[PDB]
Design an enzyme around this catalytic site. Sequence first.
Site, PDB file in Angstrom:
ATOM      1  CB  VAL A 192       4.039  -8.505   5.767  1.00  0.00           C
ATOM      2  CG1 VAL A 192       3.738  -8.746   4.298  1.00  0.00           C
ATOM      3  CG2 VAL A 192       5.496  -8.811   6.079  1.00  0.00           C
ATOM      4  CB  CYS A 193       0.240  -4.143   4.785  1.00  0.00           C
ATOM      5  SG  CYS A 193       0.738  -3.228   6.254  1.00  0.00           S
TER       6      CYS A 193
END
Lengths: 1012, 293
Positions: free
Chosen positions: B144-145
Amino acid sequence: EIDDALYSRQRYVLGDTAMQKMAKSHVFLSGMGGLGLEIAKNLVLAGIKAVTIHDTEKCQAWDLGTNFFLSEDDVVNKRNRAEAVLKHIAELNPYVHVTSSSVPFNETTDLSFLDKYQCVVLTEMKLPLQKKINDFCRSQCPPIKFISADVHGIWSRLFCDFGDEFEVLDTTGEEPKEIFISNITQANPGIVTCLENHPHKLETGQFLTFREINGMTGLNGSIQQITVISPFSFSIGDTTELEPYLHGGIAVQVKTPKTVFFESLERQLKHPKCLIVDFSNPEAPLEIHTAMLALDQFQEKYSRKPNVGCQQDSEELLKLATSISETLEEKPDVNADIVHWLSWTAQGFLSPLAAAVGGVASQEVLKAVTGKFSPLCQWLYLEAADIVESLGKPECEEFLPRGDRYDALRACIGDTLCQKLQNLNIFLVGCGAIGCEMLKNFALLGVGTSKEKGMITVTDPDLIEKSNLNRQFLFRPHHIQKPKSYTAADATLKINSQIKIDAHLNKVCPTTETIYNDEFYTKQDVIITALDNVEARRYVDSRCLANLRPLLDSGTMGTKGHTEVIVPHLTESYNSHRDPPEEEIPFSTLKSFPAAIEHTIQWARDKFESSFSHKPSLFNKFWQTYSSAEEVLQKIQSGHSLEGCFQVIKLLSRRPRNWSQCVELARLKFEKYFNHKALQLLHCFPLDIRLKDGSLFWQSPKRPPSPIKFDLNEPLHLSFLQNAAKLYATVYCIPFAEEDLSADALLNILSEVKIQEFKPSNKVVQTDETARKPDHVPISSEDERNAIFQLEKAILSNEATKSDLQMAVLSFEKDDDHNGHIDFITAASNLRAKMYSIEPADRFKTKRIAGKIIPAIATTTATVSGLVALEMIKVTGGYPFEAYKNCFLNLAIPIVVFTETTEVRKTKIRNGISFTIWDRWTVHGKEDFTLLDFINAVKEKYGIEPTMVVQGVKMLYVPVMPGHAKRLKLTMHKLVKPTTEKKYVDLTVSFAPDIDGDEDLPGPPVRYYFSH
Amino acid sequence: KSLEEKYVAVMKKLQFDTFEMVSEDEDGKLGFKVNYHYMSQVKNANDANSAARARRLAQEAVTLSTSLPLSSSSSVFVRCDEERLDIMKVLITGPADTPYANGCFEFDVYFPQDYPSSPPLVNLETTGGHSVRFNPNLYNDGKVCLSILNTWHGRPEEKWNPQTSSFLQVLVSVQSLILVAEPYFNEPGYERSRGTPSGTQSSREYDGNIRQATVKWAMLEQIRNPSPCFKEVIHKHFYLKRVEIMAQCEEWIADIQQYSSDKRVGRTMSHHAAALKRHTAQLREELLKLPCP
Ligand SMILES: O=P(O)(O)O[C@H]1[C@H](OP(=O)(O)O)[C@@H](OP(=O)(O)O)[C@H](OP(=O)(O)O)[C@@H](OP(=O)(O)O)[C@H]1OP(=O)(O)O
Ligand SMILES: Nc1ncnc2c1ncn2[C@@H]1O[C@H](COP(=O)(O)OP(=O)(O)OP(=O)(O)O)[C@@H](O)[C@H]1O
């Protein structure tokens, strides 16, 4: 030539210019007491060419308590003090030509023979003889530097006289500063403004030089004297006649020589320039000087020191001090307590204070023969009155000698404090130079020598290295590659055979907490740290805070040193300090836009690690995760995305097979690193490209890269090629010989190697100075099929055996010069500097910076160890908070600052109730005792209701968690589920704040006992 | 609107709850009753817990129990272990009018030792065996960015802040940035193709792929193989929204068929439409077989 492998740490402090002068200096040292022995040891460790120790007194039983080289055999034979220790001293440094002399010194003695010595140090000498010698010394041409040091009980005196005028070549050890110029105006005086993000950090009257200044090109190579206007601006004089400024500009600080004046000793006794070490008592040194002068006059008048407890002697000393004080310029009031204590402990000798004064005096001697730092001017008085002031009015029978070796300390601190010292249990963490000096102080003080309780535990995992012999004096050349703790423990017993020491090889860390459990910490009384890092310091501080035990900490960075004193229920802990960490260079600056040589050095270090430590490890891990290359081929053909498979394939396809291929690979790596990168960066950013505001992109701190053309004839290129080829051959396990390193062979090998023509890619260049390194770029299908073809070719070429699929991993060794890691890093950093027109560094600076080698010298270590041992006495005696003194010193200036340790800060929790970091609340229960019972007991005992209970990482009870109100009725044993080993459990509790919505106020840790 | 009110009333009671995900044997070694991403990190965590790591988590628990976002378009559901607060699972329903519309995604949440000095770790488990990179900021591996999580490029003010950043802010940022109606443009370089016919065409390709993947995993595999921590939640949500789900999937089938005549991307639209029709028939069967909660 300087033996770098032995001197490197000291070289990083002094420099080659100073060391090449110490190699031609002769030092004369008179008096072989404790202070003289400390000075001689420090000077010999420093590397003075010739030292002449001189003493006329014979050995006595009293001397054994101040000298750590004498033995009972010396006292039996009545040997000369200097000649009995001459043999032992020479072992400290074989390069030093130590000599001994016993010529009588008196009024009729001829001083003409002293002219061959550059510096003269006098200890334990009568004042009139010191006056005559000082008169003779300063009248020589060139003048002979004069230093006098003395210790009487708990009071010390240090004096310096370097002639009428002394030329200091460097006022401080700080590196010259580089200031980037943002704007300069054409005015009289012209006002210069630095880059607004960096402070000026300079002073009025200093000299600067300018380079790379655009617009005002005339300022290039000029030298100006500045006047500070603001923390971001200054003026350098008239610039109206100059050209209009455009951009750029860098100013460099120039270290101008400074002249220092001194005065004769006889005239310095009136109106003395004393260095203040306690700002709360700015007039104490003058009173101490008056008292010591009165003591010297008493010695002259009566030919004997005052007797301890004799009121007549103390009254006579007070009368002499009163008479002397009126002759001084200031006419200060005579401090009755200081004179009384000087009379009380006149015949004593406090070893740690002597060691500290010896360290300071040795640093002054080193300054005398080099001029590397601003010297002391002129007097320095160090006190230890805090030790005896808390004793009130003890009887004289405590201080009378009793015949043992501890008569020197008994006459100082009394018999009861000595008895308390002998029964101590001290846990010494780390056995570095500070640790060795602290062990020597322990041996001198007789810590732990009692047969009933005393015990000293020292633990250190490291082995002895050659570079450690420079400052860790307890070791010898034949002790190399042997444990530090064992060697130090076996060496200490020779100093004091009555000591009892236990040595461990364990590193102090949570993994070893089983051995150093809480019961072990309870057994100890004091904990002393000589660590070189911060994490272990914090861990030890947390353990000591948990176990409620005092902690002493110290550290030395070159000429700077500090001491930390931590006492339970009195002072703050070390974890309470949260000074900012090391500022990381921006990733964009490091990778693409270096501004200084340090950036290129860091880049070379990172490149070395990624090339010989990280990628070989990934290669080995990948080929251990998957058995065969055929299996990997079958998996990737079916779409399996093996972890970093393409990079391992790329490494495999480029594997050299002989020395020639290794040389070709090194040549290709050179081209890729130093020609293609610059062309790519210039393709992305031309020299004339401009930003959105129209300013040129290529300006400070950014610098325009220049492509480098290979040329084997240049020494740097050859060095880089050789280092890269050797390292790659070692990694790929390719055998080679030194003849293969010949430039002729390299030229012959490379003549057939074609250099690939550069093509510009369109990779995004991170210009953001706040960005970080991005993660893996998604692998394109073209890269996938290229890797497939490469590994299929490798399989066809039978390059798939286990030998092919394993590579040796290289560790970053820095102390050894033959491995070539430092050579490779230096070559790469210098080449990258040549790319960006950055000034090249040398091998030694690269070794210092890339290896993160902390500069260290013996004198600062000895001084801080003496101070720590001094504070250990106060800790043992249980003195009140006022007695403890934190210390910070920097011998470069020189400056010594004593400061009261930080008082513990009470934290208010609710309704006036407060706690401290040392506090820990307790609750006793039973098996049917429940969580609700726990809350009620806490509220009853401390008048405050808990709002949540946490067992370490486990949550025990939080009201907002659904269904957790049922846990109130649960018994403590069932909800905790503890082990039978522990009679108790530690919980973390917080309480309700006064304001709704605020975070729960943190309470002290709570220990609950499962049984009464 | 009555369905919206019923969804609010029912799912609000199911927003925040405990679940026994972690158990320990006689010695105290950790054993997990459900799947989780950070097994090694949990098993290697020391017992030297900072008091801040507990106080901040308790305050976050209060904040979540009070003000978790809730709507039939998009909602947040959080489950935490009955004993360890540093492990959590987050289920989010995709906002409407997006390729993630009504799709439910499961996330594994871990808190590092130095928390709140560092952002927590979040990983996605609805990738379907790492088959689909559902978002440019949400790689197929589960990464997850986000700038607030320091896993995405951004200004320092957009980064993690131990004094001000909160888990609720993280969830709001996830909803507002990842589950958007234009996921294709979240990728750097692709955001500058917004408004161009080629950029819109590539966005439609990516959105069709994401739609079929969401129907396959975030709906069909969720009803067929629900996570135990969200089993009742998933069944109630799908039963309440079922008619909207079939209407939405028919609308998506109609929409993707508009681009089937394309020559650059039209074949991909045809393949995704066939897969979507298959998964839609399967989903319709499952919804007809789904009992009323
Ligand atoms: O692994 P890194 O230390 O980050 O260095 C890499 C590496 O260079 P070396 O292998 O020569 O050390 C890359 O090469 P590969 O291993 O991927 O083949 C290279 O990529 P190119 O081949 O595309 O030049 C890249 O350079 P860049 O990011 O400029 O493309 C360069 O990065 P640094 O030298 O800046 O670390
Ligand atoms: N956690 C720890 N527990 C015990 N000893 C430690 C720990 N961390 C470091 N040490 C010890 O601290 C010592 C530091 O010594 P010192 O500062 O004199 O320099 P050095 O490590 O000998 O040499 P140099 O820094 O010049 O390479 C080492 O001998 C090392 O063994």
